[PDB]
UniProtKB/Swiss-Prot annotation:
Residues carrying N6-acetyllysine: 23
Protein name: FAD synthase
Family named by the database record: In the N-terminal section; belongs to the MoaB/Mog family. In the C-terminal section; belongs to the PAPS reductase family. FAD1 subfamily.
Annotated disease: Lipid storage myopathy due to flavin adenine dinucleotide synthetase deficiency: An autosomal recessive, inborn error of metabolism characterized by variable mitochondrial dysfunction. Clinical features range from severe cardiac and respiratory insufficiency with onset in infancy and resulting in early death, to mild muscle weakness with onset in adulthood. Some patients show significant improvement with riboflavin treatment. Analysis of skeletal muscle show multiple mitochondrial respiratory chain deficiency and a lipid storage myopathy in most patients.
Gene: FLAD1
Included stretch of the parent chain: 356 to 549 of 587
Domain note: The molybdenum cofactor biosynthesis protein-like region may not be functional.
Provenance organism: Homo sapiens (Human)
Role noted for this protein: Catalyzes the adenylation of flavin mononucleotide (FMN) to form flavin adenine dinucleotide (FAD) coenzyme.
Length: 194
């Protein structure tokens, strides 16, 4: 077996386990399942930058899709904004992830706002972006699970299933489900945030 093939079973077994982490996973999965009722798989993507937060999120998204929409032929979409020179270990992880989950990647380059705008013009049906955001400052503590982008931003629905997860929660989840993550976290990196 592999983690991707086994996601739907193992992820929902954890969510049904009653552990502290199980309750976090169940909460995330409820947000994602709600997302799947609101948005088609052409309308929905995961904001993916190779970090541990969106790695956990992608695994949750795949697991929910396998459970609620196994016959839908559409592939899972990720959105990646390239805002910095290539970092070889991170690029390899992105390519590896694309292969593992058979992803359709929507990519643009430049600043977040300009690149999101370009991506919107190229993919006008895209409505919603699953985000790995956690509650780490006053702004993120103010977010709802479904939070439209702020004024002055390309208009998307941000969906935030991990708001209540801790740093420890993210690592416990990835380790307990044997989910591959970017090798940079083994080489002294604590965050890949901007
Ligand atoms: C689609 C989208 C809409 C946004 N809308 C707003 C907004 O309305 N108001 C505002 O103040 N900020 C907005 N942001 C900015 C966002 O909140 C972060 O400040 C920014 O993405 C940098 O994230 P970080 O990795 O530094 O940290 P974090 O805030 O921890 O990142 C949160 C999540 O953003 C996603 N993400 C981050 N970097 C990328 C990337 N390069 N490509 C794709 N997804 C990425 C991932 O899902 C990540 O888990 C938006 C970002 C995205 C991608």
């Amino acid at each position: 077996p592999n983690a991707v093939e086994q996601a739907s079973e193992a992820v929902y077994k954890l969510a049904e386990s009653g552990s502290s982490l199980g309750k976090k996973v169940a909460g995330a999965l409820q947000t994602i399942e709600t997302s799947l009722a609101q948005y088609s798989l052409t309308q929905l993507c995961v904001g993916f930058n190779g970090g541990k937060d969106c790695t956990a999120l992608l695994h949750l998204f795949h697991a929910a899709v396998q459970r609620k929409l196994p016959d839908v032929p559409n592939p899972l979409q990720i959105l990646y904004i390239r805002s910095i020179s290539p970092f070889p270990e991170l690029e390899q992880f992105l390519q590896d992830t694309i292969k593992r989950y058979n992803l359709q990647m929507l990519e643009a380059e430049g600043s977040m706002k300009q690149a999101l705008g370009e991506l919107q013009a190229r993919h006008p049906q895209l409505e919603a972006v699953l985000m790995g955001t956690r509650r780490t400052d006053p702004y993120s503590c103010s977010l709802c699970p479904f939070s439209p982008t702020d004024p002055g931003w390309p208009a998307f629905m941000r969906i935030n299933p991990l708001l209540d997860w801790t740093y420890r929660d993210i690592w416990d989840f990835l380790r307990q489900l044997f989910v591959p993550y970017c090798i940079l976290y083994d080489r002294g990196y604590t965050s890949l945030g901007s």
